[PDB]
Amino acid sequence: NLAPLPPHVPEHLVFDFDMYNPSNLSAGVQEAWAVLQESNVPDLVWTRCNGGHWIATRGQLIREAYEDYRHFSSECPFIPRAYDFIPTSMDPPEQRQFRALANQVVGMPVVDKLENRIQELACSLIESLRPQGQCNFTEDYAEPFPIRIFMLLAGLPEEDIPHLKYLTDQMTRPDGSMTFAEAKEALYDYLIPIIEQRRQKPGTDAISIVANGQVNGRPITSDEAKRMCGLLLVGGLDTVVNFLSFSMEFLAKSPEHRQELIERPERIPAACEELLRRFSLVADGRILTSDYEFHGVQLKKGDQILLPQMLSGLDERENACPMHVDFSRQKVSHTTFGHGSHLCLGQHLARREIIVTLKEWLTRIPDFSIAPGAQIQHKSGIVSGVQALPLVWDPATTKAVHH
Ligand code: HEM
Numbered sequence: 001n002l003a004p005l006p007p008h009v010p011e012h013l014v015f016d017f018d019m020y021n022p023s024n025l026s027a028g029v030q031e032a033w034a035v036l037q038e039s040n041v042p043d044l045v046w047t048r049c050n051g052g053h054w055i056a057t058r059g060q061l062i063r064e065a066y067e068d069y070r071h072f073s074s075e076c077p078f079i080p081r082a083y084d085f086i087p088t089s090m091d092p093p094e095q096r097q098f099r100a101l102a103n104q105v106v107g108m109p110v111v112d113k114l115e116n117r118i119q120e121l122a123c124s125l126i127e128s129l130r131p132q133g134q135c136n137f138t139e140d141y142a143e144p145f146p147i148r149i150f151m152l153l154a155g156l157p158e159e160d161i162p163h164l165k166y167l168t169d170q171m172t173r174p175d176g177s178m179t180f181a182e183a184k185e186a187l188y189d190y191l192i193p194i195i196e197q198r199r200q201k202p203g204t205d206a207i208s209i210v211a212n213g214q215v216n217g218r219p220i221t222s223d224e225a226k227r228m229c230g231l232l233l234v235g236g237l238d239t240v241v242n243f244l245s246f247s248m249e250f251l252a253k254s255p256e257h258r259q260e261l262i263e264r265p266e267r268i269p270a271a272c273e274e275l276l277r278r279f280s281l282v283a284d285g286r287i288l289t290s291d292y293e294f295h296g297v298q299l300k301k302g303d304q305i306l307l308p309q310m311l312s313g314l315d316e317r318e319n320a321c322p323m324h325v326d327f328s329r330q331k332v333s334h335t336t337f338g339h340g341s342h343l344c345l346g347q348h349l350a351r352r353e354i355i356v357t358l359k360e361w362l363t364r365i366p367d368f369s370i371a372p373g374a375q376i377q378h379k380s381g382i383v384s385g386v387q388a389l390p391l392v393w394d395p396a397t398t399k400a401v402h403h
């Protein structure tokens with residue numbers, strides 16, 4: 001149920017919100033967190049669920065905290081207090097350095113070069129769906145898409161997907177075959193030999209670049225390698241799947257917006273940016289490194305604070321009618337990719353993945369809707385998401401474009 005209030009918390013601040021299971025889930029997952037952005041609700045509140053933690057409800061305080069790395073540690077970004085990826089729990093000499101490395105394998109220039117093959121892939125995935133007049137978009141496009149793209153990026157064989165995809169599935173959605181420990185170990189088991197192999201040789205692929213990286217002028221350890229690769233892989237899975245989904249959920253609910261883009265495809269940039277704001281999905285936190293008064297509140301050492309990336313951007317103080325999707329919104333503001341020293345390294349890849357998805361989809365399937373009489377179901381978490389997206393469309397009205 002709820003863990004006991006610690007002595008330093010004013011009752012007028014309590015407000016019990018289960019991030020794993022919010023009251024209004026049925027409304028939709030954002031809408032459900034937006035309860036924390038009602039007027040009567042304090043800017044920074046405390047809930048007793050999940051062990052008891054804080055929660056900043058407004059943009060300014062969120063930004064401010066990820067800016068404040070000295071006070072707000074990334075030792076335990078997850079509520080509740082398991083895992084060991086690089087570079088999340090690491091400080092600050094090494095930190096910037098590892099981030100550089102990765103940025104080297106997923107930065108803009110890399111994405112720019114890949115766009116082409118990314119296009120090809122989305123196109124084959126859509127085409128194989130196009131005739132059917134329906135699908136579970138979530139299972140049939142969104143899930144197969146980001147895994148494949150990592151394979152492209154890391155130059156790995158298509159034939160590894162099933163098993164690889166199995167391991168990452170176990171990390172976030174165990175069926176019970178493997179503990180979180182086991183699925184990670186096995187990930188590494190599969191990775192190590194390719195690292196060594198490619199440390200020897202030097203390729204252009206993502207694993208090669210990472211494998212031959214210096215850190216403190218010293219060569220990167222194998223142990224370090226598999227970890228970065230590790231997060232590069234799983235970091236770009238659920239978030240994209242899930243996000244692609246909200247975005248398809250809304251386009252399918254809205255022919256107007258769907259039209260805006262069929263007519264003027266150059267709007268897709270800002271569009272995509274605006275959906276990233278509207279359907280932000282990640283809810284991470286940090287841990288206090290010692291007592292600290294913050295915006296008029298006494299935080300205790302060891303404390304944990306949810307700092308919901310989802311929130312900024314839905315905060316009225318930062319965008320007007322935050323709940324309205326306007327592709328022509330002048331200033332789109334969000335921390336959908338986080339803030340401060342840990343900002344999302346994949347952020348560039350992600351955008352392109354979205355943008356391609358959207359362009360290559362609509363240019364081929366202009367007309368689609370939710371399957372008659374299905375209630376789309378959201379789930380809440382560190383990464384929020386969509387259970388399924390049953391879609392339908394008359395095939396006559398599609399078009400096949402080739403490569
Ligand atoms: C819609 C797309 C995506 C969203 C909303 C998203 C969101 C995030 C957020 C909010 C963080 C920072 C969390 C924190 O502050 O602790 C994060 C960090 C990370 N993301 Fe994702 N991301 C997405 C796509 C990806 C992709 C596609 C990759 C892999 C290519 C990825 C790799 C990472 C890595 C490595 C970090 C950690 C950076 C560090 O700790 O220094 N991001 N991203």
Ligand SMILES: CC1(C)[C@@H]2CC[C@@]1(C)C(=O)C2
Nearest residue numbers: 088234235239284382383
């Ligand atoms: C929880 C995440 C998906 C989000 C992006 C990568 C990830 C594993 C993080 O550390 C933050």
